């Protein structure tokens with residue numbers, strides 16, 4: 496492969512809320528954190544205060560927070576990295592991901608930008624199973640199962 | 643492994659322009675195209691008209707267009723950037739050079755007019771480079787020495 500996917504950056508308004516939820520939901524473990532930045536990093540992410548590299552499966556997730564006064568929601572209309580899709584290994588795991596989401600939502604340990612619950616697990620013309628959930632930032636994750 | 647990254651969705655306001663730039667810049671190939679959607683898809687992406695799966699490297703990109711507000715918003719929670727690892731320092735130079743070649747070609751329109759950053763080196767020799775796609779979305783190229 497000419498290149499390889501390395502990490503996705505997740506910008507949040509509440510880093511500690513996101514870190515806790517990502518660890519419990521995805522099983523992320525922390526590889527490092529950073530609070531001192533290059534000029535270049537600060538020019539791409541003005542006001543960044545803390546950055547953490549998380550890891551789950553093959554996925555690296557850099558979660559960071561920038562100094563801000565307000566806490567806006569995501570804007571659905573604008574060009575964007577709109578969703579991230581993870582593949583599961585069985586229809587049973589799809590149900591488990593859905594149940595685990597509701598369990599974390601009902602636990603009262605996290606704040607969520609949106610009130611929206613998970614979709615049902617749906618099947619398409621080819622047997623593919625789909626599930627969409629939102630992280631605590633209102634960002635969309637898709638779970639899929641490929642027969 | 644509990645799960646595996648499958649694809650990233652990129653939402654655009656001009657699908658044709660994105661398809662061309664992603665193909666030329668990343669070497670993507672169009673695996674398939676779709677213009678008929680399930681009720682679930684239409685509920686998550688109201689107004690979606692066309693969806694395309696592109697493949698480059700070990701990455702699947704689902705580029706899609708809904709209704710023809712431009713410009714990403716920088717302050718909101720978001721998937722803020724995607725980082726791709728390269729194989730050599732010379733390839734970092736190449737990615738920068740090829741970004742500029744495409745930008746200056748006139749073949750594409752860009753939401754923002756910002757050029758690529760310099761290539762910078764951290765205390766461990768790791769190289770970083772940032773560019774924007776035609777939608778103004780950020781791509782990071784890195785090189786991590788052995």
Ligand SMILES: [Fe+3]
Nearest residue numbers: 580637651704
């Ligand atoms: Fe998707």
Ligand SMILES: [Fe+3]
Nearest residue numbers: 504557725782
């Ligand atoms: Fe990054």
